[PDB]
Structure 1
Amino acid sequence: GSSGSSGMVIRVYIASSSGSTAIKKKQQDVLGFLEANKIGFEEKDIAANEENRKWMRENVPENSRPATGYPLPPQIFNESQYRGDYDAFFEARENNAVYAFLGLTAPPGSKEAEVSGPSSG
């Protein structure tokens, strides 16, 4: 086990074929971000592809699972493991620790690397 190539793929399970604008937005909020941040993520649709949704559902942690009706998108997933939803995404964002919440790396000089200030989760 050893190599020198970029990895850690960020797979997100969205529902392209969704209806609730909020969702669409949220999803687009998680995607747009990874896009604006030029992050190496993957767009996984749950609407069409069931396995993705199902599998994902079987992956999603209970502590993360809602009351009932499977976890709603967006849904961030590290390759296969689960990270969090738009909620966990935003939170990790405000805390400028998204990359960490995605198991990614932060750039040297950014606020993610700087991390210097009082009152911090």
Structure 2
Amino acid sequence: MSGLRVYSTSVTGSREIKSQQSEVTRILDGKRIQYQLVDISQDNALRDEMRTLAGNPKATPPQIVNGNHYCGDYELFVEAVEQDTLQEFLKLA
């Protein structure tokens, strides 16, 4: 596969991260949009890749990318859901 990807973590104490990643993936599931779910837990290279693509060394999941194009984070994903620009956000358009 090469295309849309969501970075997530399966092990974390953060309620924000867990709520936000679950919302992103459930919205995508609701729209029947295919994506690769990447779990970064205990793999620093995955965490670093996510951070490099987001251009933010403190980024946390969820983070969405399509190929090597960064799409954005939770806030901008939900903005696109509400404003109906999710095809553009996700670089599917």
Question: TM-score, normalization: structure 1?
Answer: 0.69
Q: Which of 26, 31, 53 is residue 59 of structure 1 equivalent to?
A: 53
The structure showing larger relative contact order (alpha-carbon pairs under 8 Å, at least 6 residues apart) is 2
Aligned residues with identical type, % of pairs: 35
Matches within 5 A, 1:72-87: 72-87=60-75
- Structure 2 unaligned blocks of 5 or more: none
**Residue of structure 2 equivalent to 1:19:** 13
CA RMSD of aligned residues (A): 1.7
Output the amino acid matched with 1:73: P
Q: Name the SS for the 1:84 alignment partner.
A: strand
**Residue of structure 1 equivalent to 2:80:** 92
Output the amino acid matched with 1:39: I
Q: What is the number of residues matched between the two proteins?
A: 93
Question: TM-score, normalization: structure 2?
Answer: 0.87
Segments of 4+ in structure 1 off by > 3 A?
none
Distance in structure 2 (CA, Å) of the matches to 1:101 and 1:60: 14
Contact persistence 2:53–2:65 (CA under 8 A): no
Q: Does 1:103 align with 2:91?
A: yes
Q: Name the SS for the 1:70 alignment partner.
A: coil
Distance in structure 2 (CA, Å) of the matches to 1:101 and 1:31: 15
Q: Name the SS for the 2:65 alignment partner.
A: strand
Higher alpha-carbon Rg: 1
Pick the structure with more helix per residue: 2
Deviation, 1:42, is 1.0
Contact persistence 2:65–2:72 (CA under 8 A): yes
- Structure 1 unaligned blocks of 5 or more: 1-6, 106-121
Change (3 A) 1:8 1:100: farther
